[PDB]
């Protein structure tokens, strides 16, 4: 599984990212990949809020959330998709752990 | 509030 993790505080600010799995995956361009994926996650979905905002609102009320697939474009024109799941964790202050899973197919 | 380019540069080096 090609993925990366984020941690957000309860304002939704990202306070860390873990790219260890991407760096072990043997492909170049993972920095561009992570930026592009995050930016796609945070983009307004037409008239609806971004998946980031939808997941944040849901996870803070109900403790878990999941996005459908969203697409983004690497610098060389390569089209990928990802989806995101997250979880409110009570350890310290409470934080939101998110996993972002890449589909290359 | 989305993360800016500088927000991500910081997270990715830290």
Swiss-Prot record, chain B:
A motif (LXXLL motif) lies at residues 8-12. Tyrosine phosphorylated following stimulation by IL3/interleukin-3. Dephosphorylation on tyrosine residues by PTPN2 negatively regulates the IL4/interleukin-4 mediated signaling. It comes from the Eukaryota. It is found in: Cytoplasm; Nucleus. It is linked to Hyper-IgE syndrome 6, autosomal dominant, with recurrent infections: An immunologic disorder characterized by severe allergic disease with onset in infancy. Common features are treatment-resistant atopic dermatitis, food allergies, asthma, eosinophilic gastrointestinal disease, and severe episodes of anaphylaxis. Half of the patients present with recurrent skin, respiratory, and viral infections. Clinical laboratory testing is notable for eosinophilia and markedly elevated serum IgE levels. Belongs to the transcription factor STAT family. Forms a homodimer or a heterodimer with a related family member. Interacts with NCOA1 via its C-terminal LXXLL motif. Carries out a dual function: signal transduction and activation of transcription. Involved in IL4/interleukin-4- and IL3/interleukin-3-mediated signaling. This is Signal transducer and activator of transcription 6. It comes from Homo sapiens (Human). The chain holds residues 795 to 808 of 847 of the full protein.
